[PDB]
């Protein structure tokens, strides 16, 4: 009878608040967003756990659905279980930690942002300002995740100076056209957290840096906005004018956020517009990354089905949609204390207008729609 979600790691403090998920719903459980996907997209529960008995019925990711993946499911299994359903859940930075004492602030420009991640730069004294030496090492993440993503768009769209280029992907190891620089001694580790446990390993020589989930990239908020332990980034120069990098902390990218347009109305029907991409330019589901604020930013995204076979179900994942883009007696509250950005009013509203007003043909449960189709209980 439980409602089983898992998959992206890097909201999953978030989900694992208490009353976050409202009734019926399981502990979710973090495994990547690949793994999320995969189980979502195939119903395959051994991606979150052994029970042979369970179904998958919703996942978070931050790695949005390929063309291939929706394609697949709605041949596949759209018939009989109705239309998927992707949407925003929050926006994030990406946080950019490291290990590396010094009481200067480490303040990167995203010049010297892409030096470190395509191993170019490889000691502290690198960077300017930093008040550090010593060697830089990169760890990344093993496995296919929607950190990545978020972080290889970035790259993608501004490191266009270095001997290679980044290409968008979940996998941090396959980015870099030159692959990975032997010298440069990059490391791998498994989840938002095993990332971190290798940043802050006491045991081995000082200089770990990282991309992360700003929920866990420090142990407070606060912690956020220490630079000797989260950089800033964006040092630059803006029209002649010397200027300084911003920490990752959410208010720093709530007002990029807040002029993403929401999607076409006539497009509603295409999961894929629903979730925007940032880039170098304006385009087609494509927001400019932001001149002003923190630059490294973008959404993490829920996955549901539009039916289910189950009416209390269908019940509690509508209760869920209500409370987490509700206008009152909402998630925000817990949104804020993990790090993140609540969405923007009008992009709830048309989420609710889409997927809860029983009216619309793409709303959960919706009677004419979902009559005799949905997702199996299990």
Same mark, same amino acid.
């Given at each position: 009878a439980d409602i089983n979600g898992g998959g992206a790691t890097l909201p999953q403090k978030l989900y694992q608040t208490p009353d976050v998920l409202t009734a019926g719903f399981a502990p979710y459980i973090g495994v990547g967003s690949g793994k999320g996907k995969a189980a979502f997209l195939e119903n395959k529960y051994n991606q979150f756990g052994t029970d042979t008995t369970?179904?998958?019925?919703?996942?978070?990711?931050?790695?949005? /659905?390929?063309?291939?993946? /929706?394609?697949?499911?709605?041949?596949?299994?759209?018939?009989?279980?109705?239309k998927l359903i992707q949407v925003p859940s929050v926006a994030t930075s990406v946080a950019i930690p490291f290990r590396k004492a010094g009481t200067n602030a480490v303040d990167l420009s995203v010049k010297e942002?892409?030096?470190?991640?395509?191993?170019?730069?490889?000691d502290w004294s690198g960077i300017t300002g930093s008040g550090r030496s010593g060697p830089?090492?990169?760890?990344?993440?093993?496995?296919?995740?929607? %950190?990545?993503? /978020?972080?290889?768009?970035? /790259?993608?769209?501004?490191?266009?100076?270095? %001997?290679?280029?980044?290409?968008?992907?979940?996998?941090?190891?396959?980015?870099?056209?030159?692959?990975?620089?032997?010298?440069?001694?990059?490391?791998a580790a498994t989840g938002s957290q095993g990332v971190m446990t290798a940043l802050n390993d006491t045991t081995v020589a000082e200089g770990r840096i990282t991309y992360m989930s700003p929920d866990f990239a420090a142990p407070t908020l606060a912690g956020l906005d220490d630079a000797t332990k989260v950089a800033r980034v964006g040092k630059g120069v803006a029209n002649g004018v010397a200027v300084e990098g911003k920490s990752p902390a959410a208010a720093n990218?709530?007002?990029?956020?807040?002029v993403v347009p929401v999607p076409a109305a006539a497009d509603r029907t295409n999961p894929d517009v629903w979730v925007p991409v940032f880039g170098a330019?304006?385009?087609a589901g494509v927001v400019a990354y932001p001149d002003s604020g923190y630059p490294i930013l973008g959404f993490t995204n829920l996955i549901?089905?539009?039916?289910?076979?189950?009416?209390?179900?269908?019940?509690?994942?509508?209760?869920?949609?209500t409370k987490h883009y509700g206008t009152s007696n909402n998630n925000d509250a817990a949104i804020?204390?993990?790090?993140?950005?609540?969405?923007?009013?009008?992009?709830?509203?048309?989420?609710?207008?889409?997927?809860?007003t029983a009216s619309n043909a793409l709303s959960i449960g919706?009677?004419?729609?979902?009559?005799?189709?949905?997702?199996?209980?299990?």
């Open positions: 369970k179904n998958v019925h919703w996942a978070g990711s931050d790695s949005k /659905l390929t063309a291939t993946e /929706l394609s697949t499911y709605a041949s596949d299994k759209e018939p009989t279980w109705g942002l892409c030096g470190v991640f395509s191993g170019r730069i490889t830089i090492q990169v760890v990344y993440r093993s496995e296919s995740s929607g %950190t990545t993503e /978020l972080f290889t768009r970035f /790259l993608n769209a501004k490191c266009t100076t270095e %001997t290679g280029t980044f290409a968008v992907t979940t996998t941090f190891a396959n980015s870099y056209s030159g692959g990975l620089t032997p010298t440069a001694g990059a490391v990218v709530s007002a990029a956020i807040s330019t304006t385009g549901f089905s539009q039916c289910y076979a189950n009416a209390t179900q269908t019940t509690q994942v509508r209760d869920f949609f804020e204390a993990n790090a993140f950005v609540p969405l923007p009013s009008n992009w709830k509203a048309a989420i609710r207008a889409s997927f809860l919706n009677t004419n729609v979902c009559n005799g189709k949905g997702r199996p209980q299990l």
